[PDB]
RNA sequence: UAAGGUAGCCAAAUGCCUCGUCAUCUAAUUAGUGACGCGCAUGAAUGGAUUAACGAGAUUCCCACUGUCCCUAUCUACUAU
RNA sequence: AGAUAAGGGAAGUCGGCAAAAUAGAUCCGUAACUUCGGGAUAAGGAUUGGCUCUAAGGGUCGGGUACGAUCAACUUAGAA
RNA sequence: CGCCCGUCGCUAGUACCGAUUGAAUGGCUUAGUGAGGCCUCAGGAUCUGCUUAGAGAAGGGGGCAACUCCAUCUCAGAGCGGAGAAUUUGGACAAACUUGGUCAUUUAGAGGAACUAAAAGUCGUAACAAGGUUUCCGUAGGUGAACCUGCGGAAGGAUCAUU
RNA sequence: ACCCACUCGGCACCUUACGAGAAAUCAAAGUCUUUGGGUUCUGGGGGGAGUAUGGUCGCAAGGCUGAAACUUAAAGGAAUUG
RNA sequence: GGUCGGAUUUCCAACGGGGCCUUUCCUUCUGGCUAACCUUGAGCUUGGCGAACCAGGACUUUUACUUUGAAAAAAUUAGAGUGUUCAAAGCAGGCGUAUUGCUCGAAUAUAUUAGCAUGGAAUAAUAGAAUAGGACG
RNA sequence: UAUCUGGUUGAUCCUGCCAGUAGUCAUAUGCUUGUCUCAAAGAUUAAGCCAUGCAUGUCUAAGUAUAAGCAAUUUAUACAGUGAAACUGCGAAUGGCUCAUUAAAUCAGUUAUCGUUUAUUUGAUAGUUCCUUUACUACAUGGUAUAACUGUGGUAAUUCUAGAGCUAAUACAUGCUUAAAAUCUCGACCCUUUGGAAGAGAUGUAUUUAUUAGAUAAAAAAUCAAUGUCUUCGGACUCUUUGAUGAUUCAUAAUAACUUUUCGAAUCGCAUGGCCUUGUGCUGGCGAUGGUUCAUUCAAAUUUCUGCCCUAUCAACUUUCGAUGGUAGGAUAGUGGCCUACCAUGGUUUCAACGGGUAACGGGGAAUAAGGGUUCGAUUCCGGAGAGGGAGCCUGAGAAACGGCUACC
């Protein structure tokens, strides 16, 4: 999270061309969008320099479908975290419940800085990887 | 599997066709057309099971092939052409005119109409878009494309169609105080005068709907068809006009007239 | 009889009869292995039983390999001459 | 003294004596049993040349009160 | 004169251990070989259009005499191409076979060691009364067999009891 | 140090049964068909059998986990009269 | 009973709802309807405060639970009606001057859990302003 | 329709099982069997093997007919009635059967495609294409085969075919014919600075890339860079175009080109009519078929959340060479380790991972039930998977197809 050009290819937003002939403000053309559903696009996303193709604000993904909420239990991947959604499952014979849980690997943009224990809400997107189908849209802890 | 299905067994057909569970293994699969096969009525089952004008598919074919029946002004000599909501069917022989509307039990009724009423139909616009070369167009519920509409026509509105040409005569907007037809779900067939709609941005905008007897309910925006403002409708309503009598008052009326 | 060989082990490098009897190994085995034990004459620091690893120790079988052999032939050097 | 032999492959012989086969390195895989230390290079397989490239692995100098210059190694891996 | 335990012996049955680097079947799989079609590198049988092209002869029109011009049968020869089968390089997919390995399920086995019955078999009499040594637990050793003995424990004891 | 009265926390004891239980008996074994204070472990007729096998611990003796085949109509508990 | 065993109103009561006040914000900004409007023209007239009608907004502690509703294919199950001659069944049929025709149907309920919207807000959790980098303004 | 009874004892009360009892759209079997209605039926063991015969072909008025086929037209000298065959076009990817595989797999309900393909319908939708585009040219319409058919043959045989001679298309493969206006480029030439021009070319749709627009909660002023429409050149200044979604780099439009270059009708049947400068002159209807794009429909493919039986005598599993993720590229119809290169060390698990078993296709449902529940669900409906076991592939919108091919066993 220290440099943008770490990879061997030139990281850039597609079709966002800053003309070298002109000399204007707005240092580089940075494309950003609002994901909708009342989620705020962060000022670090608008003012940052990261690219993050799979970002729900600057990247070419769209959030649509389910909105879930979990707690972050792992951050050891790159731009990807695993949240744990705990729910109660009802058994009709014994007329009572049991604790169950799933681990959901979600993609996190560099606009957010999350730690283990933070609660986040995520939005469903297109298949990002083999397992990731959600994208972090708002962190709401510290 | 492996491609599209061409059959439709009985017990898999939609129940509002009132196909008997006996008398054959198969059901008349509606061909591809302007409506979904679930919310459609083939001309075979309409002519044979509702009108009793024929007894066999052979007799329905014999009626169709001599170009007697026409629907929406077009002859449509197909046995399984899907006739849907508010499609008009003209039989020049017998000079009969039907409009496919639901009765309040959720099935299609034999609603005989006059010729000036058969000369049009209403369509619920499903999307407004810009075609090629910047031409705007709408898509109605029966897949009709109409170019150069009025710019105030947005989605979920009703347009009145000329039915000889494909032009729009006028249009009804969508807000409170509008007379609607419920086409889909549990309340399929009621008519209930929108009070207000709730948004829920993210899917399935709901609308609250109260009939003439002040019995309110709620419906998704997909199943609502505005047919005018409160009081006068733009079409002829069938018998009952979408009240949804309970079973008690229904058997009271059956004991009244007997 | 002083005590009468216990625990164990065995045709064992220790068993005469004996190529002991049974099973396995082979087409065929006085060999090998596993069992049996009235053991001529096994047996407990005369140390008994077992034992991973080690062994230019003794023995059997299997795979590979080959002139060990079927069945010999040819070549080179140094002899022999 | 040193070798090679078609087909067979220990039928030879007291007895595989002698000879042959195996062999180095890298990678994979490795059983019973065990005193848990071993067995183990178990067993059993694959690869290995030349040429043209690619990648990684260093030293010394350089900064008011991130990097650049320069020099030199044989080690490994991969690819045509 | 009740009940009752175990060894040993006969008969029958069930399962276990077991030398045999046992056997059979099925699955999976290392390594090796690897069909087929597909994609590619070519390949060009053959077929075919066009531009021509020259020789040798027929006919026609024209100085009408040699001669000149345009067409027809003949066969080289040249390109510009187009379609294009067999065959073929490399690649990926990869059946299948062989040899091993591993797992699973049945399945043989000399002998050994149990259990269950059956049967009034043999030897004792261990337990039930203080069962004639009070019983039982744990642990160890021993003896034909039930069992005996040692150490500690228990009352399911034969003692709820000595101000 | 004793005595009297009281109090908290103990090892218990005596009498009764409102109650419980199959009874023996139990101030918990009660407040459980008027069936729910919280929670852990174990059992499903008797043998075969705490056996065989496979793991794991142990120097060993053994410990922990732990079947099936087969077999059987009873075993068993508390009390009663002999 | 004011109709001839059907129904109404002024009524004593119970039952569930909503609103307001008692220290009780039970989010408010831009706009429009200005709405119920101090708006009163003589006894129906010329002029109050935005949700009661919307649109966009800024934010917006999170759940569990429960109510209602949407959805949950038909067939099957339960179940309404109906002379398959009864019945299992089926969704038929029934009524006329039967010469031309008319007409009722083919209901409804259940369909877990999960997911969706909605009212409640007790019960069981959760967070907040304490080296004030707290709120109002 | 919330029910118990016999058996341990000399007798009692218990624990406890055994046996009885009722039912089964649960099968088999024994005995018996008169009638009416209705009706399952080689699932279980062998998803073991198959003799024979059928189960997918198909035409109108409207693609192609010289049948050396049948008729009779008598309106016909091109055909025009019927019509085998064959070409062509669709279909054969549906249905039907079975339950072997399969345990987060399928499947159920619930989402999504702002992440894609879609024959067929249904509704809209190409004046732009003569290429030096003044002879390059048929546009009252252009070319080549070839089947059927005739005839010569092969083999024991097959829904086997060769050679030779014709002939067609909605077969293949070519190819033209319609406005105007506007805007851009170049630009001759006049030449002026305020600078204007004759003329030429391009401008449909489709593909590919790049770029731009696709906007906006509010109100006024200050001057310049040049005046900008017209002036009373004081500057009055307005008009200024912007759709949708919760959300997009969306829809759509516009520039620069790119394409080995898509499409933009050389097709067919009936009716034969109106205008005359009366020529086979010009116009002219009702359809059928086809055709690019969009939408729709029939779908398909992936996909969100939650839910599956028994086992720990399976507690750690995954990652050599894909395991989890990142970047970039290939491939796909598209997302995505789907694959490749580089890089990081990740991912699951006592809330039961992984492994094993299932005499396990899942569900709707079925039996029995006071309630709760237990067991079953191969099987009439839905959804999967399969065509003896694997694998591969052509055609096509749609198949890893099997009543379609290829290979191995
Ligand atoms: Mg159909
Ligand atoms: Mg002895
Ligand atoms: Mg001996
Ligand atoms: Mg030997
Ligand atoms: Mg021996
Ligand atoms: Mg000695
Ligand atoms: Mg030695
Ligand atoms: Mg040899
Ligand atoms: Mg030998
Ligand atoms: Mg020998
Ligand atoms: Mg010999
Ligand atoms: Mg010998
Ligand atoms: Mg040697
Ligand atoms: Mg060894
Ligand atoms: Mg005796
Ligand atoms: Mg005796
Ligand atoms: Mg004793
Ligand atoms: Mg005794
Ligand atoms: Mg005694
Ligand atoms: Mg005793
Ligand atoms: Mg003793
Ligand atoms: Mg006892
Ligand atoms: Mg006390
Ligand atoms: Mg005490
Ligand atoms: Mg039991
Ligand atoms: Mg038991
Ligand atoms: Mg007793
Ligand atoms: Mg919830
Ligand atoms: Mg007894
Ligand atoms: Mg008795
Ligand atoms: Mg019973
Ligand atoms: Mg089966
Ligand atoms: Mg099918
Ligand atoms: Mg169309
Ligand atoms: Mg990618
Ligand atoms: Mg990746
Ligand atoms: Mg199965
Ligand atoms: Mg099916
Ligand atoms: Mg298939
Ligand atoms: Mg078969
Ligand atoms: Mg196949
Ligand atoms: Mg078949």
């Amino acid at each position: 999270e220290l440099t943008v050009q770490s990879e061997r290819a030139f990281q850039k937003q597609p079709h966002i061309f800053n003309n070298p002939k002109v000399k204007t403000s707005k240092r580089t053309k940075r494309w950003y969008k609002n994901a909708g559903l009342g989620f705020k696009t962060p000022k670090t996303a608008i003012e940052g320099s990261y690219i993050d193709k799979k970002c729900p604000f600057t990247g070419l993904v769209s959030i649509r479908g389910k909105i879930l909420t979990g707690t972050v239990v792992s951050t050891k991947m790159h731009r990807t975290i695993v949240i744990r959604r705990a729910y109660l499952h009802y058994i009709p014979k014994y007329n009572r419940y049991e604790k169950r849980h799933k681990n959901v690997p979600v993609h996190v943009s560099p606009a957010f800085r999350v730690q283990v224990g933070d609660i986040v809400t995520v939005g469903q997107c297109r298949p990002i990887s083999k397992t990731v189908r959600f994208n972090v849209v708002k962190v709401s802890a510290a | 599997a492996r491609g599209p299905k061409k059959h439709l067994k009985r017990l898999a057909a939609p129940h509002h066709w009132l196909l008997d569970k006996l008398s054959g293994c198969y059901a008349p699969r509606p061909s591809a057309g302007p409506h979904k096969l679930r919310e459609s009525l083939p001309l075979i089952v309409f002519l044979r099971n509702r009108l009793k004008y024929a007894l066999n598919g052979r007799e329905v074919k014999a009626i169709l092939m001599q170009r007697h029946v026409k629907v929406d002004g077009k002859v449509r000599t197909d046995t399984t052409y899907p006739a849907g909501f508010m499609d008009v069917i003209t039989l020049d022989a017998t000079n009969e005119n039907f409009r496919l509307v639901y009765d309040v039990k959720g099935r299609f009724a034999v609603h005989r109409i006059t010729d000036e009423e058969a000369s049009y139909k209403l369509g619920k616009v499903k999307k407004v878009q810009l075609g090629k070369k910047g031409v705007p167009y709408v898509v109605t519920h029966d897949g009709r494309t109409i170019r150069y509409p009025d710019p105030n026509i947005k989605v979920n509105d009703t347009v009145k169609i000329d039915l000889a040409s494909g032009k729009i005569t006028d249009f009804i907007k969508f807000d409170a105080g509008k007379l609607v037809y419920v086409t889909g779900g549990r309340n399929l067939g009621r008519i209930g005068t929108i009070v207000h709609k709730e948004r829920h941005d993210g899917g399935f905008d709901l609308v609250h709907i109260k009939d003439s007897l002040d019995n309110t309910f709620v419906t998704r925006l997909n199943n609502v068809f505005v047919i005018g403002e409160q009081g006068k409708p733009y079409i002829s309503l069938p018998k009952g006009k979408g009240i949804k009598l309970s079973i008690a008052e229904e058997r009271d009326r059956r004991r009244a007239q007997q």
Side-chain angles (χ1 to χ4, degrees), chain B residues 3-216:
Chain B
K5 305 209 164 196
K6 303 194 288 194
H7 291 62
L8 180 60
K9 313 182 174 193
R10 275 166 191 258
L11 316 181
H15 193 250
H16 76 283
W17 288 1
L18 308 170
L19 284 187
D20 74 308
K21 67 186 284 186
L22 265 297
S23 80
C25 294
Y26 301 100
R29 186 188 185 87
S31 297
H35 302 268
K36 304 287 216 54
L37 62 84
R38 302 300 291 180
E39 52 97 22
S40 70
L41 199 68
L43 272 70
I44 169 168
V45 67
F46 174 67
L47 265 70
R48 179 189 48 183
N49 305 70
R50 301 286 91 85
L51 291 182
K52 316 300 178 181
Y53 280 166
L55 319 175
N56 312 316
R58 192 220 309 115
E59 294 179 350
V60 177
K61 171 60 74 177
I63 290 179
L64 279 147
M65 206 39 71
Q66 45 184 358
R67 299 181 152 254
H68 260 116
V69 56
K70 83 186 60 175
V71 53
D72 292 331
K74 311 293 199 61
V75 177
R76 304 266 159 254
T77 175
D78 175 35
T79 318
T80 61
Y81 180 76
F85 185 46
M86 296 189 72
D87 298 0
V88 306
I89 298 194
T90 312
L91 268 57
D92 52 357
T94 71
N95 60 272
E96 282 184 89
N97 286 276
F98 311 96
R99 162 161 281 144
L100 269 300
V101 290
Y102 299 100
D103 76 329
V104 75
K105 291 296 181 43
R107 323 176 285 244
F108 277 124
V110 290
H111 180 35
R112 287 181 170 83
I113 66 188
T114 184
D115 291 332
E116 59 86 13
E117 203 197 344
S119 54
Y120 72 94
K121 97 192 283 185
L122 302 185
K124 168 188 179 184
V125 293
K126 288 298 183 60
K127 56 173 62 168
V128 295
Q129 279 183 356
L130 275 300
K132 284 308 172 61
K133 307 188 183 298
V135 182
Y137 68 99
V138 308
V139 186
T140 75
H141 74 275
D142 56 329
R144 281 182 162 274
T145 303
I146 300 155
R147 310 217 301 165
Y148 304 108
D150 191 282
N152 304 338
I153 297 177
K154 297 305 181 171
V155 203
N156 296 316
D157 302 354
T158 290
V159 290
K160 184 164 160 160
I161 306 182
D162 174 63
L163 260 289
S165 74
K167 303 307 196 58
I168 292 175
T169 80
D170 62 324
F171 67 100
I172 302 97
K173 291 296 292 181
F174 191 88
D175 62 335
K178 291 293 169 51
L179 195 74
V180 300
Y181 208 100
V182 190
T183 179
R186 187 164 156 86
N187 303 126
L188 158 70
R190 318 187 67 173
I191 297 164
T193 311
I194 295 179
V195 288
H196 92 281
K197 51 161 303 190
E198 45 186 1
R199 211 179 167 196
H200 305 125
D201 281 346
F204 310 126
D205 171 86
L206 293 180
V207 57
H208 304 254
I209 284 170
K210 63 102 178 179
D211 51 358
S212 297
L213 296 180
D214 296 330
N215 296 115
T216 179

Side-chain angles (χ1 to χ4, degrees), chain A residues 41-87:
Chain A
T41 174
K43 64 178 74 174
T44 169
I46 310 179
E47 294 293 328
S49 296
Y50 72 99
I51 295 304
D52 194 31
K53 182 183 58 183
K54 303 147 166 180
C55 167
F57 311 107
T58 49
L60 283 293
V61 304
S62 61
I63 284 183
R64 78 286 182 275
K66 294 287 171 57
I67 311 293
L68 304 183
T69 317
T71 179
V72 185
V73 309
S74 178
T75 59
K76 294 178 295 317
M77 277 178 282
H78 181 249
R79 291 174 161 181
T80 308
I81 57 171
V82 171
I83 70 178
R84 169 177 198 176
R85 314 213 308 127
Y87 56 96

Side-chain angles (χ1 to χ4, degrees), chain A residues 20-33:
Chain A
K21 262 187 156 173
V22 300
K23 181 66 174 67
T24 176
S25 180
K26 195 254 188 174
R27 302 280 77 80
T28 49
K29 281 197 185 59
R30 183 150 179 87
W31 182 90
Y32 74 103
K33 68 153 177 292

Side-chain angles (χ1 to χ4, degrees), chain A residues 89-126:
Chain A
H89 172 57
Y90 182 71
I91 288 91
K93 176 186 190 195
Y94 299 101
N95 209 26
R96 64 194 69 186
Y97 302 85
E98 62 177 50
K99 289 202 207 321
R100 294 196 179 186
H101 83 277
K102 310 273 210 187
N103 285 10
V104 187
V106 305
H107 178 272
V108 48
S109 86
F112 306 102
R113 183 197 281 103
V114 296
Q115 280 78 22
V116 177
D118 292 332
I119 58 170
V120 297
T121 181
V122 299
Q124 189 196 349
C125 46
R126 78 165 183 274

